[PDB]
Amino acid sequence: SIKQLTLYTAELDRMLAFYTNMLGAQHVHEQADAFTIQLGVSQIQFRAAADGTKPFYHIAINIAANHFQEGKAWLSGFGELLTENDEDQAYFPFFNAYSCYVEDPSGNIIELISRQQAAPVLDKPFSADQLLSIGEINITTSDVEQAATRLKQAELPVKLDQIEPAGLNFIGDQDLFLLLGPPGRRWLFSERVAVIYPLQMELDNGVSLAITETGELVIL
């Protein structure tokens, strides 16, 4: 799992307000030029972006197998559900998962993903407290092959021979997938195209990595 994910935002105040309203004050902690949100076992720290930049990312959050429709209703309370092909939800056969989407104030593509066999069945109502963990984060890089190699050296599940430098590459198993790809292409459910912005993350296993502002994946 992702223990800590650090992202940048040009809209810190609006984002603070948005996530405090969505998740509750108990899940959000404000700092001077950053704040954190707790998503189950995962934390995201949003930091002030450099002037003249407007970073955004694609983040999917795991929810229970049996709570996709509740999650979808809940999400729609915070913004208009995104659509693709006139559909306001998606089914992904490869992940056997249902997904729904909204944009936050920075234009982040916030997905709720309900993995039908790779998530728990929770016999209990859905709420902000039932966001399980981070299920997806884009790793948008200036060198996909170099990135894949470093990730495998970091001992992450990478099938090097399958890596497509020009497309999206799913890295992981179970309930967490890093979306490794180049910039350029429009994200599903969004007007926005993949663009390199910096981030860093620490995994549950103690592995930590960074994407520099030029798109280099660097294993910290």
Binding site for Mn ion (CB under 5 A): 60, 111, 136
State the minimum distance, in angstroms, from the CB of residue 189 to Mn ion.
8
State the minimum distance, in angstroms, from the CB of residue 58 to Mn ion.
6
Burial of 58 (0-12, 13-18, 19+ CB in 10 A): buried
The vertex-42 CA angle with 122 and 120, nearest 5°, equals: 20
The vertex-67 CA angle with 61 and 71, nearest 5°, equals: 55
State the minimum distance, in angstroms, from the CB of residue 51 to Mn ion.
29
State the minimum distance, in angstroms, from the CB of residue 196 to Mn ion.
18
Closest CB to Mn ion among 43 and 99? 99
Closest CB to Mn ion among 179 and 217? 179
State the minimum distance, in angstroms, from the CB of residue 92 to Mn ion.
8
Closest CB to Mn ion among 100 and 151? 100
Closest CB to Mn ion among 84 and 143? 84
CA separation for the pair 89, 82 (Å, rounded): 8
CA separation for the pair 70, 137 (Å, rounded): 23
Ranges of beta strands (E only) in 20-148 are 28-30, 34-39, 42-48, 58-63, 90-92, 97-103, 109-115, 133-140
Q: Can you give the C-alpha Rg of the chain in angstroms?
A: 16
Closest CB to Mn ion among 11 and 111? 111
The two counts, helices (H) then strands (E), for the chain are 3, 14
